[PDB]
C-alpha cells in the first residue's frame, strides 16, 4: 500500500471579482503527548500566580484561526487595498503523506529513526463541538505564516472548572459539592479515524452567513450629517443671565443629531504582574458560594481586555497590542489600532452640566439607544473567528478583537499516535511520532466597491513599511511584520459616505 | 498489503426510546503464553491451600462480560435512571489493525522492537462452546472500563477435573481409574483463522429471548396487597385460655395471604483463610469413591456464595461484596446490595409455635410453593451473563449474581501468535507479540415505563457520590467507583405496584 | 334526558354442555367517603395491636371475587355435581339506572331526600392495575349473595408501606430515608368517566388461559399405582442381624415409587391475640435496616396462613376456616377442607431411620423433585381469583386458597360522587349520595367428564345439609350455609384414575 | 453529552420527608424546602 504520493503540494492565491482562494500546505510533526494518558494538572503555579485546574490530553490539534497563515504578505496587501469587504466562505482541509517512525536511542549514534508501516494515527474532527473548544483568538502555534516552516502541533488541554471554586473540597461543603460535579471529557468517547501511511483524509467546513469584515473609514461622524448652510429649526432653552429662561437657534453648520458614539469603558489599567495573574482591564469572577479568601481577584477571576470599544481609551497601554509571538527569545509588539483614520472609532463623550459650557467626561459610556460606530480594525496578524459560547442570553456582541463571531466555528481537528504497547509490561510503550502534510484551502467571499471621492486614498504601500518587513536573513530565519506599518490595516483604507 | 487502516475507532453510546447502543474500542496486547505449548499444572499450592489440577494453554482470550466495559459512568447513569427494564440484544466484535513485532534484546539498548510482516496471528471463536467455558462471573481482565487503557489479554486455562479425585492414582484403584478417563482439550483441534497485519475479522452474537434486568422497587410486600378498611372473612382457630378452642376474625388491615418470601439460607459464614481455600458459605464437594482423607473439605470441595437469596442474611460478611479489582496494590470494596429499597428482598420468616406469639426463626428457608420475590440487584460493575451448565436437571435458577443466565452465552474469542520456530533447533522459537484494536458494539433492548406515583423517586444523583468518583489524578491513573453510592444500583430506582 | 330506563334487571343461570352463564344484578349505594379527600391514617391501634400505615381515598369500589355472588346455591349444586372442571372465561359488568340525591336534614322530619339531576358520579376502572390492587381473597362486602339485597360499596384504601419501617423517621436515619421515598397514589391522576342520571357504562374482562378448577378425588395415592399380584424386581439392602448386609425382594402388593406427596409445613399455631396482631402460622417480616425494637414480630411482619399444603396439619386450628361474615353480630364458621375424600391431600411423610422400622416424622416437608398432589378444595363461599404480585421470581404457586392466581385479574371498578362544593366557603360541600344497579354476567367454561367407575359417587344432596341451609326467616333475613355440609365442596365429588 | 462523569439529578433522597404529601386531615403539602422545588440550571452540563 505504501509508496504512493497520497497527495501533493498546494499553494498560492487566486483573485477574482467576487472571490479569493487561498491554498496553503505545511509539513507537520506530532509527539506522543503526555504519558499517552489524560492527566489532571494544576498549571501556572507561582505562589502569587493564578494557578488553573486543567485536564491535559494525549491529543494534539490543528488551528487555522489566523489570517497570516492564509495570505502571503503580498496577497494580503492586494486584498486590503483593492477590496472593501470580505469574509470566509468555505474551508477544505486535507491530512496526508503520513509517515510514522519510531525512535530508538541506542546510545551509539542513537536516535536513528526507522519507519513503522502498520503504525496508525488517530484523527478526529469534533465538528459539532462536543468537546471543549480551544481555538481561542490570538493563540500561538497556528498554521505557520511561512510555508516550508514546520508545524509543531500543540497538545490539547482544557479547563474543566475555575480552580478556585474547588480549592478546598475538604474543609468546605460548597467547594466540595461543586467538585463532585466537575465534568470530564475524553475523545476516545466518539468515533474517529485511524490511518496507516498509505492513507489520507479530508474535512470540509462552511462558514454560514457569517459577519463581514468591513474595510472602510469616514472622516465624518454620524452627528455631522448636515448642510452647514441651512439652519435647523430646533430652538433650544438655556439658563440665561441672572434668573430667567431664554431660547435660541444654533445658526447653520451647528446642529444636534440623534446619534451618539459607540459604548465602552475608557478607564482602568493592566495588572503589573499580569504575566502570572489576570491582567485584564476587567476581571469578572464567579463563585457559587465557594471560598476564595484573601486574594486579589486578579488571582481568582478571568480577564477580558480591551474594553474601550467605541470610545477613546483615556490612557495608552489599554490598547490591544500583539506579537506574532510567542516563544521566549525576542519578537516585536505591534498594534493594529495604531493607525486611527475613521471617525466613528475614537470617541470622547462629555455631558454639559453648567450653562457656561463646563463639561463632564464619561469614562464609562454604557449602552444606550441610538449609538453608532464601526467595528475595531484587524490585520494580517489578527485572528479570524471566535466561538460564541452556548448561552441563551447575548448582548450586542461586537468583538474588540475584530474576529468573526460564530456559533458554529470551524471544528477542531485532533490527532494522536496509536498507543503501541509493549510486552514485558512495566506499562511502557513504543516511542513513535508522526509527520505528514496538511493543506488548507479557504474560499473567501470578496466584494469590491467604488466611490465618487475625487481625491486619492490611503494605501498600504511598503514604501512606508520597515526595511526588515517580511524577510529572510542569513540564517534561514524569517521576519514577519516588524512595525505597525507592516501589519496592514482594516479601517485604514476606503472612504465611505454614511 | 500492509499500510491500510483496516479499521477505525468506534465509541460512544446512543439512546432511543426502545434501544441503546454501546460502542467501545480498546487497544490490546498479547504475549506468547506458556512455552507455546500446553502444560499440566497444579496451581494454588500453599501446603494448606486448595491446589487445583489445570491445563494451561498457549492461547489468550477476550472477555466482555462486564457492564462497566460498555457504558461510561454517565451513560450508565441515564440508563438506570430513565429505563425500567433492559437486556442485551446483539453484539458485534471486530479485531483489526493488527501489528506483530518481534523482540530482540541485544544487550546494548535491547528490546528494540521490529515489525514482522508475514507473521500470523491465530484467532478462533468457540461459538458453540466445544471447549471449556471460562467467562466466569466477576473475572478480572475484561475489556477495560476506560477506553484508551490497554487490554492485556488473559491466558487461557481450565480445570479438567477436581484435583482431589486423582490425588493418588498410584496407591488407590478408584482415584486411578478416574484419572484414566480425565479428558484433554486443545484448540488446534478445530478450524480457525490466521491473519497477517493487513487483515481483520469480525464476529457477531445474538442474545436470544434472554432474561430481562428489572430495575424496580416496591415498599410493599406480596402479603400486603389488601384494603385496611375491609375485613377478611377468614375466622381462625387458636388455643384459648385453659383448655378449649375459641375462634376469631382479624379486624381489617390485618390479613393472611398465600404468598411467602423468597427462599435462601441466611446463616453460615466465610472461611478465615479463604484467600487460599474455598471461602464459600457453601462447599458442595463430590468424589466418586476417591480418597480425600483428612482435610477440611474447604480444601476439597468448591464454594458457592452468596446463599441468602430472598432472605435477609443473619450476619454481615455474607453480603456479596466486590471490587473492580483485582491486581495486588490497593482497590476499594463495594457492595451493590448495600442499598436496600425493595420490600421483596430482605425477608425474615418466622414460624409461630406457641399461642402467646413466641416465634421461631428460619435461618434456612427452603423452596416451597407460592414464594414471591425480586432478583438480586446489579450495578455498572456487575457481570452481564453466566453460562448455564449442560445438565439435564435444573432448579428455579435465580442468580444471586444478578447476571443473565443463558445456555448459549457469547462465545469466547481466542488468540495466540503463530509458533514461528527457528533453525539451530534447541526447540526454541522467535519471540514476537501482538497488538491491535478490538471493537465491541452491543445493542441493548431497553424499555421505559411510567407510573401513577405522585411523589418523586430515588435517583442516582452524583450529588451523593464520592468526590473521587470516576476520575483521573495527576499521574494518568483512573479511579472508578470508590464507594457504594457510585456503583449505581438496580432495585434502587422505580416504584412498581404488584 | 332523565326518565329513561337506561337498563333492566338481569338474573339467572344457564347450563350448556361446555359453558355456564351467570347473570346477577344488585342495587347498590354509595356515601361520600372521607372528607371528599385523601387521608393518611394509622389503623388498628390497640397499644399492643399491629397498627398499619394507610392512605384512605374518597373512592369506593365493586368486588366480584366470590363464587357465592354468581351462583344460586341450587345452581352451584348442579355445577359441582355434574361438571368435573370449570373456570371463569369472561365477565361483563354494567353500571346504570343511576340516581343521585342530596340529603337535607332540616331538623323537622329531616333527611327528606331530593333528586339532584345534573349531579355527576365518577366511575373509573383500573384495568391495567396502575393503582394498588385490593380485591384480596376472602374480603367482605363483595357483591351480595342474595339478589334483592343492597350492596354497600366499601371505601378504597391501601397500605403504602409497612408502618414499622418509618416508625421513627425523626431519630433514625434509615427509617427516615425510607420514609422519604414512600409513594402516593390518587385516582384523579388518570382519565375516567363522569355520568349524570340519564347515563350508563359497561366494562368487559377476559380471563386468559387461567387455571382450571379441578373437582375430583382419588382413593389412590401416586405411590399405589401397581399390580398387587406382580412382584417388583427391586431387591433392597438392609442391615441384617448382628453385623452384615443382607438383601431382599418385597413380595408383590408392596413396592416403592418415584412419587412423594405434596410439600408443606404441618406444624405451628395461631397467635392468641390474633384479632389484633398477625395471626398467621407464618409471619415473614422485612425491614431494610429500620428499627422495629422490642415487639413480637407478630406486631411487625405480615401473616400468611395456612401452610400445610399437601401435608396433613399436625393439629386442628391450622385449618382454613371461614365465614360469609364479617360484620359483628353473629355468623357461623365453616371449613371447606372438612370433608377429606381425596388421597393426594392429607399426607404424613416419615423417614425410616433405624432398620427395626422406627420412623421420623417430617413436620416440615420442603419442596423436592417428584412431588405429586392435588390443589386445595373450594366451595361456593371461596374466593375466585388472586392477583399474582409483580415480582420477577416465582415458585410453584399452588394457592392454599383454591383461588385462581392470575397476573391480570379483573380490574377494579371505582366510583365516588362529584365533590359539589358550596359557596360561603368554609371548605364544605353538598351532601349527596348515589344508588344504582350493577349487573355482572360471567361466562364460565365448563367441562363434563365420564368414568368407567361402576359404583355410585358422593353427591352434594341437601339431604345431608342443615335445615336452615339457604333460607329466609320471619324477618326478611337470609341464612346462607350454616354448616360444612352446605358449602358444597371441590375434591368432594368425582373419582379419577391417575 | 460526551461528559464521562455522572450529573446532578433531583433525587427525592435529598428532599424533605414532608415533600409532596397528605397528612391526617386531608391537607396537602407541596414543596417544603428548596431541595423539593426541583430546578432549572440544576442539571445538565453543556460545553459552550
JSON list of C-alpha atoms in Angstrom, two decimals, chain A residues 196 258 483 497:
[
{"chain": "A", "resi": 196, "resn": "UNK", "atom": "CA", "xyz": [-1.76, 3.92, 8.14]},
{"chain": "A", "resi": 258, "resn": "UNK", "atom": "CA", "xyz": [-29.98, 61.59, 17.32]},
{"chain": "A", "resi": 483, "resn": "UNK", "atom": "CA", "xyz": [6.36, 47.62, 12.95]},
{"chain": "A", "resi": 497, "resn": "UNK", "atom": "CA", "xyz": [-20.24, 58.30, 2.95]}
]
